[PDB]
Amino acid sequence: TTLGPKIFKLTQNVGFRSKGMVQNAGVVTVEGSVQALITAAYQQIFGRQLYQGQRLKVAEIKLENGETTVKEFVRALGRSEIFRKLYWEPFYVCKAIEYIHRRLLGRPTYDRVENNRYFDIASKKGFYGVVDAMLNSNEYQEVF
């Protein structure tokens, strides 16, 4: 509805579709709807855009070329370098987890059962381990 925030879904082919248009056509309208999806990924995962060195290209290049989905572009961003750094590293371990959950699955944790699942996965596997559960849950897939 209009009572909540917009949801961006990349339906626009992308895929580097091609056509029956001039071979080196200058304008290709929808090759710019992907681009707004790309910036909107950043705006959920980190909350703002990154600075120049920081952006992760070569993840975008592939999304834009149609080789990987939206789902996997989020995974690359989630398991990235600055994401770790900004949000994992400087905080107490469970503060890191609670905050990371809001960014990757849009809501706060409900429980201690849930919180603990990750707290005891982070102690064996690290940042990487924790990220990969939020990303691999059943709930991620049903919802997103």
């Binding site: 339906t11 200058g26 304008v27 309208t29 710019g32």
Partner: protein, 160 residues
């Protein structure tokens, strides 16, 4: 265009065009002949405008055309005016389309990376465009000069 933009939003939400979207197509198409006249006048004076804008760019930025300047020399200056000719052309396209789709894919997306490589000072390209606005705008009626001016200020905006 206005058409492309309206439709893409329609198709992406799986729906027919809105009353609003239909209205803007109607207002847009009514301005067709006028927009075509604005492009003609500017196409007809393209030399005058590009040269003049170069004299004024090189007055506010005398060093671009100086020892350590990107446009220093006769053929580094020739390419610079050619780029000014490119952008005036794209501005005529934008005016007849009623939005930037074409202007954008052809000459702003990727422009930072292109000019950074060539080491061209971007903000002085933005000045060259303001200079063209000033010249072009002096060859158009008040109403048409404003309508043209929006597209000049867009390019100035995108190089930023």
């Amino acid at each position: 265009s206005v058409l492309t933009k309206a439709i893409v939003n329609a198709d992406a939400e799986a729906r027919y065009l809105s009353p609003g979207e239909l209205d803007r197509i109607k207002s847009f198409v009514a301005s067709g002949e006028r927009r075509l006249r604005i492009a003609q006048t500017l196409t007809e004076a393209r030399e005058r405008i590009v040269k003049q804008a170069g004299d004024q760019l090189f007055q506010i930025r005398p060093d671009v055309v100086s020892p350590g300047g990107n446009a220093y020399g006769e053929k580094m200056t020739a390419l610079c005016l050619r780029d000014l000719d490119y952008y005036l052309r794209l501005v005529t396209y934008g005016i007849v389309a009623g939005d930037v789709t074409p202007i954008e894919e052809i000459g702003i997306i990727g422009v930072k990376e292109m000019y950074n490589s060539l080491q061209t000072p971007i903000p002085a390209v933005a000045e060259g465009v303001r200079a063209m606005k000033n010249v072009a705008t002096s060859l158009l009626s008040g109403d048409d000069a404003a309508e043209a001016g929006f597209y000049f200020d867009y390019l100035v905006g995108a190089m930023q």
